[PDB]
A paper describes a structure:
The [name] sigma-like subunit, the nvRNAP enzyme core, and the template strand together form two nucleotide base-accepting pockets whose shapes dictate the requirement for the conserved deoxyuridines.
The structure of the promoter complex has been determined by both X-ray crystallography and cryo-EM to resolutions of 3.38 and 3.80 Å, respectively. Where required, we will distinguish the X-ray and cryo-EM-derived structures of the [name] nvRNAP promoter complex by referring them as [name] nvRNAP-Pro-Xray and [name] nvRNAP-Pro-cryoEM, respectively. The −8U nucleotide is partially disordered in the [name] nvRNAP-Pro-cryoEM map. The cryo-EM- and X-ray-derived structures of the holoenzyme in the promoter complex were very similar and could be superimposed with a root mean square deviation (RMSD) of 1.84 Å between 2563 and 97% of all Cα atoms comprising the holoenzyme.
Author numbering:
A (entry chain D): 99 to 292
B (entry chain d): 1 to 426
C (entry chain D): 584 to 631
D (entry chain C): 1 to 649
E (entry chain D): 390 to 534
F (entry chain A): 291 to 406
G (entry chain c): 51 to 484
Write the structure that this text describes.
Amino acid sequence: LKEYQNYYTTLLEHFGYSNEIKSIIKDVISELAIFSGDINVTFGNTVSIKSLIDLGNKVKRFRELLHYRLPNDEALEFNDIEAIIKKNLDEIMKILSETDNMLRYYIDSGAGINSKQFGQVLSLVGSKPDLFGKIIPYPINTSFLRGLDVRSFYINALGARKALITNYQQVRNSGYLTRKISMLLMDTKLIDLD
Amino acid sequence: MGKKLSLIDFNEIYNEENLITRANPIENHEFSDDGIYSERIFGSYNEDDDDKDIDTIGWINIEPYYIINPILFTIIKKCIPSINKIINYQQSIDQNGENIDLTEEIGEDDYIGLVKFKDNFDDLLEKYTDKKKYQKEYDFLIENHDKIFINKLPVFSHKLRPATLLTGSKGKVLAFDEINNYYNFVIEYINQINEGVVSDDSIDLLLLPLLYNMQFYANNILTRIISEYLRGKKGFLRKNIMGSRINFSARNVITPLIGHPIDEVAMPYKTFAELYKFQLINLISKVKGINYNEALKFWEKGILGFNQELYNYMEELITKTKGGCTFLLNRNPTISIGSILYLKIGLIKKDYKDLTLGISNNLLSALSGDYDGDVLNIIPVFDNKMKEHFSLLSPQNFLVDRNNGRFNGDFDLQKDQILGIFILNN
Amino acid sequence: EIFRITDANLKGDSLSRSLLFEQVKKQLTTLDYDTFNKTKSSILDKLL
Amino acid sequence: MDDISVIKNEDYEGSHRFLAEELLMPNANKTDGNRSTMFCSHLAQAVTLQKAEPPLVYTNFENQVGKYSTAGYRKANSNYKVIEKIYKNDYNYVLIVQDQETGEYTLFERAECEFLTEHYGFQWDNDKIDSLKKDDTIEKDTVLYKNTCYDENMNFGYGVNLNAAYFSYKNETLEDAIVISESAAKKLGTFSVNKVKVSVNTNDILLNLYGDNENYKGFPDIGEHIKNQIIASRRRFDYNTALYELKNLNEMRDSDTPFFADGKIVDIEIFSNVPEEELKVQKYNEQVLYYINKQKEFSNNVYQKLKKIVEGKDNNVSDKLLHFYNNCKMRIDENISYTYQNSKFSGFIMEFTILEEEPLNKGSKITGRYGNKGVISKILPDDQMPTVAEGRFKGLKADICLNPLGVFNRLNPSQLIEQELNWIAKFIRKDMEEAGSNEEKVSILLDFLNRVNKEETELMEEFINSLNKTELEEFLNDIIENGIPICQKPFFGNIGLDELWELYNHYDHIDYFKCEGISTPLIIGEIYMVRLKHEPHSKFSARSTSFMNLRGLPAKSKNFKEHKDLYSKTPVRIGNMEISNLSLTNEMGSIMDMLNSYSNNETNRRELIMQLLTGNPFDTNIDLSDVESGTSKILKSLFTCLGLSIDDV
Amino acid sequence: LSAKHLLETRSSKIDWGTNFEENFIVNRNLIYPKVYNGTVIIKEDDFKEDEETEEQVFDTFTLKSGNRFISISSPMRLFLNKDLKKQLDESFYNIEEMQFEIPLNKLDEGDSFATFIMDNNELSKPLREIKDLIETNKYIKDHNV
Amino acid sequence: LRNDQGNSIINECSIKQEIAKIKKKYNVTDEVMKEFINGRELNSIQIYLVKIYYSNKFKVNSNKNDIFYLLYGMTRELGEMNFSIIPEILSCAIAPNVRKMNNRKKLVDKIIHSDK
Amino acid sequence: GSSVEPINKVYKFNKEEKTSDIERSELQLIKMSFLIEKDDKKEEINKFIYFPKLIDSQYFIINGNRYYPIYQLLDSGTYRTNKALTLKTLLMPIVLREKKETFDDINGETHTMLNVDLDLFKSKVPFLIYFFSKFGFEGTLEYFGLQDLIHVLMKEDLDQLDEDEINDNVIFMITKNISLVVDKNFFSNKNNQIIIATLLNCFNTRIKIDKIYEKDYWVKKLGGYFTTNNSNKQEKGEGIILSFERILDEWTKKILRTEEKNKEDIYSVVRWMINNYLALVKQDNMNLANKRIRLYEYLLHPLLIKFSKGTYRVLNNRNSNKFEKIKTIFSNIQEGFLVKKIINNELLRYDNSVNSISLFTLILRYTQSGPQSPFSSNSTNNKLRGLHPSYLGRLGLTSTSAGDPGASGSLTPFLELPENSYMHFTEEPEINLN
């Protein structure tokens, strides 16, 4: 599908950026989307919790990944923790995509299932920052689906509050920067000298 | 071709016909005739018969004394220091009355009085001017020497500083803007200086201290006007000059619409029946064969509840007109390219209770918004000649990316439409 | 000489841009930025 | 930050002492914090529903919350005994009651509305109080009247149960959009009550909107419904010229001041400041002369009814009763003049309370419990929506379709668990309904309840064995009809993942429903829906030409607040960056002409208005003039006040 | 806005040193020695006032591994154990030799010795420096185009 | 606050359209107006009557030229009907002062007892 | 004293052109009495004030509108801010500020210590000079309890100083001739060293042996610190002392959790605060163990403000009869003072709710903003908007206002406030200090 953008840009420059070819391309976009809608209704796209459960019995490697807790008998730095999560998350995308399942078309197109976000639902979360950026030295050992604990709950609440404070502050001071640059860099003009 | 700012002279545009001499703005339970809120000069508040332009300005006469120009005061305070303690009178006295000279601590020239400061201004400058640190300021004052001392202080109309004489049972209440307090102080002071008629050597301690105090209030007037009307964000400079409110406008919500070209939208019945209000009356008047007064009351009844006679005239308007009715749609705030577009109208919703604007899904990504419940602003465009200049902002012209020259990625398949094609294409 | 974007506009040569940006009191009372000698034309002068 | 080390999970075991406002939402230990924190605001903004129902999956915590919220129901503090009851209107009436343990006296007033805020309210479902009559006895636990939320047996409820499925419908569910069947829209409802204050002076009159000249009905009656969204219109009258002005009072004129409102009028009250002798003769002021008189009659009644109580030697009365008695005895006296806003008005002023039912319309918002906020986009007849036509229970139809794209991306897997639980409940309910006598039927239920919440089994067994045969049969029939309730706690005590795995494994006869014309297995469950306050008509605004500010620029006018107009005629301002983004195009003269002719120059505005009104409607070729704008004059005046001028060249 | 919404952040490797690895296996925000017999010798001037908590932070020290000794160059700041600091005031306080003596044999086995805090590498840090280039005049003043 | 502008503009345009139609119908020229005005000023009674008759369609403005055109239409329309006294009264000027008179109950009785 | 007056009455028919209001409101009458006494005049002033009454135990009804009271959360006091230790008070926020200083002994050893100043009345003044003015030199030495360790010796005594006691008792310079005798064991503790540093900072080069025992010697110094004119240097200073004895009121006495011995008056409070300066400054701020909730004291503010404004004017009067000014203090008391000031300043929050679920929405809601609130949007104090591990178990970590995070939460319904502690979450402070 990414090859489509290369096709359109090979059409504009072929006909010399004419005003007529812009209208025709504007017509193609409308017709392509309308016929796309009919496929969704007839075929249907669903998300079901039973889809994950059914896959567990057939594929043994998936069962171990679902119930995975960080071993606590070995010393691990904060660099090794990130290595484990990336190692496990990478293997998840290989098994799901290669084999048939409900979510096969959700991953191959890569539109709706972000690689990092989807890992938190299945695999463990890891570590979270605090109000002052310092890393909290209490990594979460349980995935979202498997459940949470009270000590882990407090760490999660810190992350949510930081989003509200940052979002509110950025809204108050958002257009301050764009006003300064826009006022100055406006008087430029193009001449046609060779 | 090029705007330029420079100083002005008060004595050239002075008008003798209108001037203000009164202390109490209120007399006989009404606004006075020669006060600050006078109706003879500045006009009337809620009366349109007077037809007095805002540019009308008033004058206050000060004579024969002179004052330092308030605009130039901050410059002079930097050219030489200690101006606050050089135009003030602090004469001491012994028991009998003989003056005691305590000038040992003070400088050679201090506490001389304003009326003597003006006479010997040329000689006083040379003593305390630094030629290696304030070279620019020194040359500026030499060029503009006539406007150092002013004679008359202007005052603008009350249309910008309103005041109400609303009455109540507990007693009459008067409310005004803060600037009026200082304007009523300078008039009172000057009125209390010219009482002397017979030729008499006025005592210095009775007249000189008042002149210095008056200049203090004159300086604060310039600070107040520039710190409350122009400098602030809510001031007139950044609210009514570079931005403005505007008529012929509406606000609405977003609701997805399918099965139509990419530049066709459908507006609710109510908003389109009032934005294009004036053109509707013109169409009704000719067909129905009635004058404008009779047609107006017909349009009033056709907007309270949904009907059919008005709708038939509505549909024909968007079909026969040149170019089709169009409007500019933007989003608060605009920070991204294409946040404001130039769309077209192609459908009118039959329902009366519907109050949502129906747009396509592809065009949504351009605004970088979503259906969370944001409110847009709609501004129609009328002039035919003006339309051709705005056509460059249409979504057709944004199809090519200005950044690189390739096909723009924003006006492409996004969200579920990407998934739908992949199922069929593979 | 290169300048900060805030001081580049104030110490420029235009008049319309200076008054509509910031620091109204500083530009009109004193002459640190020398507002009295900026006569360059601009496309935004039509508003004034 | 190492202060976390003080927190220990040993003590926080089996007790929900660390949750505020999250007690209602179940499975709170699954969703993240960013989505959970939205639930508090969503619960803070939730309007009342007419057909409120208790949730199917309850957290066992809402009952106490409902009991301890005293803003919706009023019970009897102590055992009372009815003394008297008197009428005031068609609906509203009051009653005076006496204690049996202290000798004090109190009052209870029956109403038909409540003004929670400027727009939203509810309607009292006063049923028990009406049945009380003729010196009965009120017990300690009895409830006089209650809101629409509370059901018959004090069970709380703040939403509805709707059949739902995850599906995509013609890309109409992009981002956050919801389609909904017509039956669900009929089920969902809302209330609305507003108060309007009309004013009349000596000069003004009221037009004969309703009725002919025989009955000069200026305003609607007590129980009638208003028409054309016009409650009353008053026209100014001048002494100098009235011969050609009052020729026909049955039609609107050019200079009128009508009042707009919608609904059904329930309550009125009129306050007057004119002598009655002058009001007795005016024919047009007829209907008022009726109501006022009736009102006074009511007051006289109380002065002749309980005057033996307060004025007697007992005097054991509560503060409310004494205050009401003094207020009602104020009116019947002479030489009394009211005041409003610390001022003495001349003409009389009344009050109107209007009630209306607003159905669900396009543009509204509905959210679930887990903060899966959505927006209604397009409603359909129930025929179009997907249906199952292959299984044993053919006929079930989904009522709402949600976006399937943003479920995992939103990081909240609770909705899947709830839908799966309700689907398993549906299957087990159908299996129980298929066959089985009452002797073993309950067993089929108990097994299912054994693997979901072990705490519920004991209460199930106790309640089942407590009843007799007939009530047990009735309860089984009721659970067959509606559905098996499933209880699980928010934080400690619920199903996770292994329990779901085991539950799925045990039941091997379960398959997805096969819809018609879909060719993809699908599951339909039941979910909880709560309406939200946000509405499209509360922010929609348009403006053609309203009142202008003193300077000359358009400005906000306060007329919508007093119900003098339909739309909030407020203009939208062009921001700091809007002008620049418009100036993105190299054309600037067109921008200047547009701004000057729209909101700067008066002569240009008038010329444009005239040229648009008269001429050619199909094609417009306006030609603006050149006249110095107002803003230029304002700036020149201010600058010459400062002492500086702008010089060209 | 969007990138900052990604709460999860990356971590950077830290080179503790040869003698650091041979004697202390660091687990998260904790430090444990191989053998408790070896003591630690710290001079008076080593301690410095912390920027935030005002506690004593000894960035560099040399362990007193009996007769042998190897200097330690800790890349990050170190916080002394709360338990051991209680006895440091009088017992372990060694002003006579101008060098504190901390006998690890006094410390019990499997106990905390030193806690260190680490700041994550903010993904928004490069974006901020772009803004600072225009205004702060830190780098733009003393360079050509 | 000041009044609105749309209603005023509509009323003024209605007056303009009405005077244009009056010109069109009777092909009146400016010479007719010169010979009909006689240079007389505006008195109150004629203004009141003109406001009375043309009240339903629109309202009378303050411009004297439009008022005199509407008065010529007044005279033509009420002379072509059965009325005779009113056109003659409105034709020429009026007395500077309005005469005072008693109750005139006899003529008042005549008008009252009339079915009109 | 003051009391609530009865309001129940049965109206009797009258003809006096009575005025009644259209809208309903509920009020209650409070009567206060004062006895103004003079040489001959002994006037008695009885004032009456209207205060809204709590109906339905939840809301006030004023002018036909409904208003919901809300709790306010604020620190108990004696907390720490940037380079300062502050104690909240009704109207006068006494604050202690610390600054580092350098000193050299006789042998030339250099020490860096701390000196504390009371930033009261817009000035920087050493905290020891107040005690030196009130109780005197010897009086202050006895009062602190360090008089057995502090001595002053002259030049001749310095010549005859104990050589073997030089190491045991460190001798510090006072003037070119006068020396100070103090023990090294007393000098061991930093908190003890604070007093020595402040005492050495108070004195100057010019001194007289007999001037030390005279209170006026530094009373005039305090006056010169306050008033520059030499004529009034005495008198003005005296006034300050009087004011310094009235800074603390009864409510702050009742609120504080310290024992009785450290609660007699302002001087005892200052002594107890300065004895344990290090431990107090080492504590944190965000902990909940030292915070409380108020409901009415933040509603009775305007009356206190008006009384303070009235009393300052009569305190700053000169060469006039006092009785007239004292009468003018109480002359203006409007029956609608409290209601108007409360409504106009938006102290109460307008009731704007749409749902019937009121338990979690408005019954239990606390805001950190309002009068005497450190929270401020423009101040950008992100520390106050965060969370602390002490929040869990006694507050809601989830419910936050989307408009301004951290400024509004919700109390946990299971919270059990300890009885007879004036709305205190705990019964002991965060730092035991035991």
